[PDB]
């Protein structure tokens, strides 16, 4: 699929990623957790890029959106920036 709706959180240290994964299970809040933790110039937008082509931001994203099914929070994944957790939506 060319364009998909995707939310991404990048964690610098694994310990926080584990706390997030458990934190999302205990609480559950992919959008709000991404915005607070990302604290980056793409926290507002990278935490909610809306729909964009499979080749805009990070290649690793194309793999999992083509690996996991949409509507399937997959991650946290491994990427150079740190841990990538990707939520897939619409996929079109």
Curated annotation (Swiss-Prot):
Intracellular or extracellular location(s): Cytoplasm
Domain of life: Bacteria
EC class of the enzyme, as a word: isomerase
UniProt entry keywords in alphabetical sequence: Cytoplasm, Isomerase, Rotamase
Protein's name according to its UniProt entry: Peptidyl-prolyl cis-trans isomerase C
Reactions it catalyzes: [protein]-peptidylproline (omega=180) = [protein]-peptidylproline (omega=0)
Described function: PPIases accelerate the folding of proteins. It prefers amino acid residues with hydrophobic side chains like leucine and phenylalanine in the P1 position of the peptides substrates.
């Amino acid at each position: 699929a060319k364009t998909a709706a995707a939310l991404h959180i990048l964690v610098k240290e694994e310990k926080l990623a584990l706390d997030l994964l458990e934190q999302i299970k205990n609480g559950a809040d992919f959008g709000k957790l991404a915005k607070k933790h990302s604290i980056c110039p793409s926290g507002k937008r990278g935490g909610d890029l809306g729909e964009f082509r499979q080749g805009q931001m990070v290649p690793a994203f194309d793999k999992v959106v083509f690996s996991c099914p949409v509507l399937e929070p997959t991650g946290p994944l491994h990427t150079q920036f740190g841990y990538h957790i990707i939520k897939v939506l619409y996929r079109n």
